[PDB]
Amino acid sequence: PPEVLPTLREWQGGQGEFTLTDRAGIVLDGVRDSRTAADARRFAGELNGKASVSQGRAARPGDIVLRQDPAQKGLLGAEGYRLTVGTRITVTAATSTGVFYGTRTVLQLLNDDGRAARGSATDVPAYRERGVGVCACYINISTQWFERLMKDMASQKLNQLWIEAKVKSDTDPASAFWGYYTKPQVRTLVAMARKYHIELVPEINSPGHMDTYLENHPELQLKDRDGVASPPRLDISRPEALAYYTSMVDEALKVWDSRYWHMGADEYMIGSSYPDYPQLQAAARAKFGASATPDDLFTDFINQVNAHVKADGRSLRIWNDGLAGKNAVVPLDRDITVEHWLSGGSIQQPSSLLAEGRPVMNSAYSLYLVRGGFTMQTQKLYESDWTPLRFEGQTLTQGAANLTGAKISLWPDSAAAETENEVETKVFMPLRFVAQATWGGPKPSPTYAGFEALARKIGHAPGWENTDRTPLADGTYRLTTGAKALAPTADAGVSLVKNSAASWALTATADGYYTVRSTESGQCLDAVRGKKYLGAPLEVGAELSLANCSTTARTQRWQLDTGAGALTLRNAISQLHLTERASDGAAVQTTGATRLTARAA
Numbered sequence: 001p002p003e004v005l006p007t008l009r010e011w012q013g014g015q016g017e018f019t020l021t022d023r024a025g026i027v028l029d030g031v032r033d034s035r036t037a038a039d040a041r042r043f044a045g046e047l048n049g050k051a052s053v054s055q056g057r058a059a060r061p062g063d064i065v066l067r068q069d070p071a072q073k074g075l076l077g078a079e080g081y082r083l084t085v086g087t088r089i090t091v092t093a094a095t096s097t098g099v100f101y102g103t104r105t106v107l108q109l110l111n112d113d114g115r116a117a118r119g120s121a122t123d124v125p126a127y128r129e130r131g132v133g134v135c136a137c138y139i140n141i142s143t144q145w146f147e148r149l150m151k152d153m154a155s156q157k158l159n160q161l162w163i164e165a166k167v168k169s170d171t172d173p174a175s176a177f178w179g180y181y182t183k184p185q186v187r188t189l190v191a192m193a194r195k196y197h198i199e200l201v202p203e204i205n206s207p208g209h210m211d212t213y214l215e216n217h218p219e220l221q222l223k224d225r226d227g228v229a230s231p232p233r234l235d236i237s238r239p240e241a242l243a244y245y246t247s248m249v250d251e252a253l254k255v256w257d258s259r260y261w262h263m264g265a266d267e268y269m270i271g272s273s274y275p276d277y278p279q280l281q282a283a284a285r286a287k288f289g290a291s292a293t294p295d296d297l298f299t300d301f302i303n304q305v306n307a308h309v310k311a312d313g314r315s316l317r318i319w320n321d322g323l324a325g326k327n328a329v330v331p332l333d334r335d336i337t338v339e340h341w342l343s344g345g346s347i348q349q350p351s352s353l354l355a356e357g358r359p360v361m362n363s364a365y366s367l368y369l370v371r372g373g374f375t376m377q378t379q380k381l382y383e384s385d386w387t388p389l390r391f392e393g394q395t396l397t398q399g400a401a402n403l404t405g406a407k408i409s410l411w412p413d414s415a416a417a418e419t420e421n422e423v424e425t426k427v428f429m430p431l432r433f434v435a436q437a438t439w440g441g442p443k444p445s446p447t448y449a450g451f452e453a454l455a456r457k458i459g460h461a462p463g464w465e466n467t468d469r470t471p472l473a474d475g476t477y478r479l480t481t482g483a484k485a486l487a488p489t490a491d492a493g494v495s496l497v498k499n500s501a502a503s504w505a506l507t508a509t510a511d512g513y514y515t516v517r518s519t520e521s522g523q524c525l526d527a528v529r530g531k532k533y534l535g536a537p538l539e540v541g542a543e544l545s546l547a548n549c550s551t552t553a554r555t556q557r558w559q560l561d562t563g564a565g566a567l568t569l570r571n572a573i574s575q576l577h578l579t580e581r582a583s584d585g586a587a588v589q590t591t592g593a594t595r596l597t598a599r600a601a
Ligand SMILES: CC(=O)N[C@@H]1[C@@H](O)[C@H](O)[C@@H](CO)O[C@@H]1O
Pocket: 209, 266, 267, 319, 341, 411, 413
C-alpha cells in the first residue's frame, strides 16, 4: 500500500507507475463547481511544473482527473473519494470536499519523485468527526497561527476545529477584557474554515468556568450555604442566569455562524458538595420533585440551552464529566453530543452514553496538550494501538453508529510556560496521529518510528507558512517613530524618548520570535507587570520593562510584525503590541501598536 497519511482504507495494487510530466493537466470532468475549480487551481500550482486546469476537454493519459459526480453521494458520502492511479490519476467524489481530500492524497503520492505505483482505493473516513480543539481563553491565539493549523488539518483530512474563545461583546461590554477576538477576526476565521473544508465548533463555557464573564457580574454568581460566592459558577437557579448565558451564546453564534454550539458544562458540581448548596436543592425539588438534585437542575439548564439553539437550527454539544448518574429525574436531551474526556467516580461510562443513542465523541485527556503540563504521548498511543474505541476508563469491544470520532485538544493552563509557536511544533505528530486514527485505514508500520518518519517527510500542508518569522537580520538597530526612539527609562522601564540615540540587539529565537536587548544596559525587553491570568501578563496598559536575559522567560520573546516602512513588536505570550503611552511616552502593551522603523546601527 502507498505511504500516505492518513493511510488509504484499502488498496488494490497494479503494475506500472504513473509519472507526472510537464504535459500533465488537471481535468475537471464532472459538474461545474466554483469552489472545486479554485481549489484545483491551487492544487495545480502545488505540483512540480506547470499544469493547466480545464473543464472542457476529455482526460488523457498523464492527466490528473478530478471528477465531481453528485450521484456518487450515497457511495462516497460527503467526504469520500475513489482514487485510481493508472496511466492517468482519477479522483471521483460526490462533493468539493471529497475532491479536495483526494487531491491531498495525490500530492503525497507525487511528493518524493513525481511517480506513484499503480492501483486503486475507495477512501471514505471511518469516523465523521475528526478534530483538533484549541482553547483560546485568557490568552489570545493569533489568527495567522489558526490559519496555519487549518491548512495542516485540511492536508490530513481533519474536518472539525473546536475553539473556546471570547468574542468582544456588544451585548455585554463589561465582559470585553483581554484576551478576546473582535467580530471581524471571528469572521476571518469563519472564512478560513470554509475555504479549508473545516467545521468550526465554538464554545463559551457555562455554567462553570465563567470567570472570564462573571467578574463584573457578582449578582449572577452561585453562593453556598455559608453565603460564599463561587466566582466561576453561574447561579442556574436564577432565571436571569439562563437569559444572560443565552444572550452571549446568541451573540457568538451570529458571528461564528456554525451549525454546532459547545456550551462546555465541565467542572460545575459533584454530589459530595450537595449539603453546601441547599438552594440549588430547593430549586430542583420545586421543579422536579422529592428525588431531584442539583445535577437535575444542571441537566435541565443544558436542555434549555439545547431548545434555545435548536430554535435557530443549531445543535448542542457538552463535555461528559457532569454526567455522573446523579440526575435522578432529568435526562440529558438525546440530540446533545457528549465529548468524553474524563473517567472516574460515578462518571457515566462511554458504553452507557452510547447505549443512550446520543452522539459521543472521544476527546480523551490522553489526547491533550497542556502548556506547562501534560503532553500527549503519540508514540505510546501508536504502540498500544489506540483507536476511538479506547476512551479514558473503558475500551469498547466494538464500534457504534453514534461514536462520532475523536479530537486532540490544546489547553493554555500555564500560559506563559510555552509560546504558541512552541505548541505548533509539539502538535505536529499528535495531529497526524488523530487524523490517522479517525480516518481509519491500516497502520503503515508496526511501530511508531516508520509513522513518524513518513509524517516528517511529507511535512506541513502546501501553503502552510503565511508569515516571515525572520524579517530582520540579527544585529543592532535603532527603533524609531518620528523624532522618538525606543530607549531605557526610569525604574527598569522603556519609553519612546525624543531625540534618543538608544539601540537594541535583535536576535531571532528558534521558535520564530526575537530577543530585544538594550545595548545600554544589556537587559532584555520583557512583560512582567500588570494583572496575570494563568501566569501570563494579559493586562492592556501594562508597562514593558527590562530584565536579565533568560532562555526560559517566554515573555522576553517578541514577534516582528512587518510593514513596508515600519514594524510592530508583539509579545509572544500576551499577544499585545508595544504602544506609546501618551502622558509619559512609556512603552506599554495594547491591542493597538506604535509603528517603529528599524535602522541598522
Ligand atoms: C474539559 C477540561 O479539560 N476541563 C478542565 C480544564 O478546564 C482545566 O484547564 C484543567 C486544569 O487541570 O482541568 C480540566 O482538564
